[PDB]
């Protein structure tokens, strides 16, 4: 059928009628798979885990394993994956811990390339790209349209802002505000992702307002609280600047400079 | 020879000699040449041609579509030559129509565990890609180059013949032939004198290349002035011609 | 003791009581597996290799392969793994070479996370943590209670001292003394793993003697020789300082500064 007979499907697994599963893949207990999803060959799915519609998961991926994190001690934690995601070769995704929200969450239209790691309790939004070997250490929040280039390392609890960009081999120990571009080990704030803003149809007015907001946070010698007070006027006028100001206000590990 | 637990597509073409391990998939339009050993748990996808006396290790994906968004299903190709070793979990992607629609690997290359050969990359002969080396795409690696563990190469970069990268090198610009580079970002340190000894280079050639490095890196010349100074040495020693041509064809700039 | 019939067990392999082997795993010739070891699915074991008791080995791991450069050709060479080790998704562990130890050795209670690499002739002690994609290039010694954060790179012949710590994406080219914390590419010494000493129940006076032993080596412009002769007395008092002194005395290839 669409389920390869060489696949192991746990009787407790729930598959929508058109789900494809390849040879030598394991669909574990308490795994749910939504309509149109294709599971390649040599995939291990472990639950409790929910996968949505029209997803593609590639060979040698381990989706829904326990974190090796020594704070995890066997409790019933979840992984939720949305719709229209692509999960490439050798990707590892772990379920959450009771210490946080007992859930790891991915939304829709994400591209997660080969040997990427999505650590316990991470939250990925929609339309994100994680290039080869991007490692999210745990409790990492990645907001919509962020792009992490190959071998980007993200420390535990870091927030990656909407429409942000990391250069290849970036080592992120602090939060990346929305729209900010970071490079290097350790990661350094260069500019804003003006290329991504134009690709996603931002107004000229919003881009100019974001250009000015960067300057207020990074280039006028303000403390963060001083910069947040200076951003208030622009943030009230433009939602993009409010997105920026909020990423800064909610950046619990401080911002990448 | 072909394990009964392997899946061979009807449209694949295997030379008589070829071994395929259990639980390996040999997909549509994959050709595998005589003496080649496909390990267990290998995924091959085409259109792909693999030459003679290759060895591909468990959990490799060789000939997959690039996930690069600019790829759209075109029947792009991967060509691998002879006598290559492809170790555990290596990813090799076919080309894109935007470039020349082909990822190309030559002969006698060693590609160690979890290395990545991005779409449209061109590898020559006798190269070593150490563990987790990543060719981002459209990367040209000339003969005898050695990239140490976790070397990242930016799209379109050229790695010169007998060049060498230290472990964790991040290469954003062309590496000239023989040049040894280290760090993130990568910087030129010296020449691969050991690679030269390994090839039985004459003391004369080794001497002239030591001079040539100084001309380019240590004597304050622009690249133009450097090329002019190298012309006589380039004419006398083919070994220096290689160095000189690698700088000539680096329209991007050279790793400093 | 569930041996999945879909695994290939070599007639020369030896399985102790309560060994589990998941489906589509290979236990090669001259592989020995000790009591209660769990081998997951899609595992490749090559010998000659001896694995002890109550280990866990995850899917896609290659344990006991040969080093890839054909210039190390030579047999037999060995891999020894002790007890209570956890080896996660897609770990590579290579046997030794006749040109050196002829053995790769791992002790007990080690955590080796996804896609870590243990190079030929490496020696790992007890209670070590190697985080995602840590690579020991070859002939690397990791002493007890060391932690290597994700994507730590270790050069051939380097020693990682007892209770030492490396920040994520460290490139270690020189010996890391016992207790010392290192960060960056290339790796630099920042401090000592005090947080680690405390949670191992080190006496406060021992911790203070190590705070002094650090300053005596790194921050007082002493030679190595000078530094050692000054710590003779403290090293006679505190076994802990002796462990620090010994890690420096036995680094003729220089220490990470
Ligand atoms: N989608 C792709 O083509 C590539 C690009 N890439 C990147 O990190 C983006 S290229 C950035 C480096 C530059 O400036 O060339 C990448 C890096 C490492 C492995 C696979 C990859 O996939
Ligand atoms: N806990 C995990 O599973 C994480 C933590 N981590 C780190 O680099 C730091 S963990 C410091 C060692 C200690 O656990 O005490 C990490 C980084 C990059 C990828 C995966 C990772 O796995
Ligand atoms: N021959 C092998 O099997 C090794 C060598 N190697 C290298 O990066 C080259 S040696 C690093 C340089 C120095 O130790 O000083 C390496 C590095 C990281 C992972 C696996 C590796 O495989
Ligand atoms: Ca700045």
Numbering used by the authors:
A (entry chain B), C (entry chain A): 2 to 258
B (entry chain C): 3 to 258
Manuscript text:
LpxA and LpxD are functionally and structurally similar, sharing a homotrimer architecture and conserved active site features, especially in the acyl-chain binding pockets that reside in the dimer interface of the β-helix trimer core. Herein we report the discovery of several small molecules that bind to both P. aeruginosa LpxA and LpxD with μM affinity, identified using a targeted structure-based methodology that utilizes molecular docking, surface plasmon resonance (SPR) bioanalysis, and high-resolution X-ray crystallography.
The complex structure of LpxA with compound 2 was solved at 2.00 Å. Corresponding ligand electron density is seen at all 6 active sites within the asymmetric unit. Similar to 1, two binding modes were observed for compound 2, with differences mainly in the conformation of the flexible side chain bearing the carboxyl group. Five out of the six copies of compound 2 adopt a binding conformation represented by pose 1, with the carboxyl group placed near His156. In the other binding mode (pose 2), the carboxyl group is pushed away from His156 due to a new conformation of this residue. Many of the interactions formed by compound 1 with LpxA are also seen with compound 2, especially for pose 1, including the hydrogen bonds between the carboxyl group and Gln157, and between the carbonyl group and Gly151. Meanwhile, the benzoxazine ring forms non-polar contacts with Ala136 and Val132, and the hydrocarbon ruler Met169. Whereas both the ring structures of compounds 1 and 2 are buried in the acyl chain pocket, the benzoxazine ring of compound 2 is pulled slightly outward, likely due to the hydrogen bonding interactions between the substituted amide group and residues His121 and Asp70 that have been proposed to be directly involved in catalysis. The docking result predicted that compound 2 would be buried deeper in the acyl chain pocket, similar to 1. This is likely due to the protein template used in the rigid docking procedure, which failed to account for the HB interactions with His121, Asp70 and Gln157.
